[PDB]
Amino acid sequence: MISSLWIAKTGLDAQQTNMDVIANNLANVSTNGFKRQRAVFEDLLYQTIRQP
């Protein structure tokens, strides 16, 4: 948590979640009536340190 080891950890976790979604989609290819998943990401609150 130096504010740069947390921000990059968050990105790593997001990419891992996306990979989990992709692996779930690929594993369920042979199932009947399966609707594929799609991962959506949004950036959290940006912090303002000093006004323009």
Binding site: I7, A8, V40, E42
Partner: protein, 250 residues
Amino acid sequence: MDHAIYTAMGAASQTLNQQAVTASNLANASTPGFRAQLNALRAVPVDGLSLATRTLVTASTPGADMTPGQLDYTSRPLDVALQQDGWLVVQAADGAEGYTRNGNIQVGPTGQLTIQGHPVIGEGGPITVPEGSEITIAADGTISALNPGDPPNTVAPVGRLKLVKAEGNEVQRSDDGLFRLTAEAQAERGAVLAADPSIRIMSGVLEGSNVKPVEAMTDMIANARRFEMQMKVITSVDENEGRANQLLSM
């Protein structure tokens, strides 16, 4: 002490701030419709008597990058992508009007269009679609709704998405990620941006993030080297003071 340590320390801390901005940009490398933040160091010279020898450094985020990102083809009639220099209009968190590029338009059970949970702003206030109806979005933003069960002859327009034109120098990213007009730009263009009839959207394609990887890599390498440099000085000053304190002896 010698306040030269307070210059290199500032240079080392602002480098960590720049790294925190760059890492935040890298985390959002897959966010749909994301605008990367620009980071730049700026030098402020301390004014006063005697040789103007001290010039501190402070990071700076001069707006964002407006270069359009990748267009992923998702065969979904609700996901739209905007022409370059274009923006979709949504209702912000505090009932205000904000701008975005995320075209992941969703339909609620009640029939209201939303983007990231914010209501979508149509030619006349938020857009409400007939409940549980198929939606097609035209090139100029017109919305056609097909009621299931009824024949395809029933397709009729319902509302038009508000599409605005704004450059990078006019918009500022608010704290919730939604862009809003800057003060100077708002004073000249009015409070609410009028819809531009020339803007063209594409249905079935979703715009990705414009985070350039090569610039990010180079920025992290340069930041690490600069931090190590400032750290050398922080060590030089320490030893110099340690020794200079001896003159106070005898």
